Amino acid sequence: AQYEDGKQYTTLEKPVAGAPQVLEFFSFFCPHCYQFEEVLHISDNVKKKLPEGVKMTKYHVNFMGGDLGKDLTQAWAVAMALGVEDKVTVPLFEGVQKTQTIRSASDIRDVFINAGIKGEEYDAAWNSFVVKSLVAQQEKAAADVQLRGVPAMFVNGKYQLNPQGMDTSNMDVFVQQYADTVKYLSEK
């Protein structure tokens, strides 16, 4: 066929019931994730091709960057609760991977303050039980699908994107193939 299990995607032998429709995992320590975000705009291009009614979920993971990695997952929880993902995503990537000015929870916090979130509002979110369960959700969702690598995308808790099996000669062609695959998997 044109889309084949084991080529543009793999199928989970252990499907996950009740999973978000489009589920994406990343780490701010993850170099391909930086590319996916800053250079390729994968999330955005997938959205642009997704049907009517489909919601898109993105979670951070703990297994990179040890102690700071966990801080980053809680911070991404803060970002989701406050609805400020689009204002911190880029400076978080660049702070971890480009300038290397993020070395502590306090440095992560600075990124939010500079993005205009108020100190008191950030510290309140950081410490809130709503953020605790949002951290729990991120971990549970990664736990459910056996996740040992990022970037990763899962469709309807049963299919996993396999970007290794796509053209990387052209960056735009790669993205379109990737998104069209999400749309195909989505309609399955």
Side-chain angles (χ1 to χ4, degrees):
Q2 295 280 349
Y3 292 101
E4 281 183 332
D5 193 323
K7 189 58 204 171
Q8 297 103 322
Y9 67 99
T10 54
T11 306
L12 299 171
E13 293 176 302
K14 255 264 293 184
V16 176
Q21 289 166 285
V22 178
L23 181 50
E24 202 176 332
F25 293 101
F26 79 111
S27 170
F28 285 113
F29 281 96
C30 159
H32 282 130
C33 301
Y34 187 110
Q35 296 291 303
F36 266 41
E37 172 60 30
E38 311 256 293
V39 180
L40 300 172
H41 309 280
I42 291 288
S43 291
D44 200 84
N45 279 287
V46 170
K47 186 181 198 101
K48 289 209 282 75
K49 287 200 170 164
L50 289 179
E52 170 207 331
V54 167
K55 90 172 307 292
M56 217 155 155
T57 307
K58 177 136 81 186
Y59 290 158
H60 198 265
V61 296
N62 294 340
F63 61 81
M64 295 187 80
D67 210 84
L68 249 190
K70 282 213 80 176
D71 279 329
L72 281 166
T73 301
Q74 192 167 348
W76 186 247
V78 176
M80 289 188 291
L82 297 183
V84 293
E85 298 93 330
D86 295 350
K87 302 173 182 195
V88 296
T89 288
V90 165
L92 282 171
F93 267 116
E94 299 193 352
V96 179
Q97 303 189 45
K98 195 187 171 177
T99 56
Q100 290 180 348
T101 47
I102 296 174
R103 316 209 208 68
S104 68
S106 175
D107 293 340
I108 297 176
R109 183 177 186 271
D110 287 344
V111 169
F112 285 71
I113 298 292
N114 186 47
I117 291 81
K118 297 167 176 164
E120 212 126 53
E121 189 188 356
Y122 180 86
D123 301 339
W126 184 266
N127 284 303
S128 73
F129 288 83
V130 176
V131 156
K132 300 210 182 311
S133 65
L134 227 55
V135 167
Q137 285 164 229
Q138 296 181 88
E139 299 182 12
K140 180 187 182 284
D144 284 348
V145 301
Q146 329 335 324
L147 186 72
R148 95 180 73 95
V150 284
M153 187 177 287
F154 295 89
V155 185
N156 301 272
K158 212 183 183 227
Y159 302 105
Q160 177 180 355
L161 274 285
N162 182 43
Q164 289 96 319
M166 308 175 185
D167 310 334
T168 64
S169 63
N170 179 286
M171 301 192 95
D172 302 306
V173 170
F174 170 73
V175 175
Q176 289 330 306
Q177 184 173 4
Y178 195 100
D180 291 342
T181 300
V182 174
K183 182 181 184 282
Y184 160 83
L185 288 180
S186 164
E187 289 153 9
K188 224 174 159 75

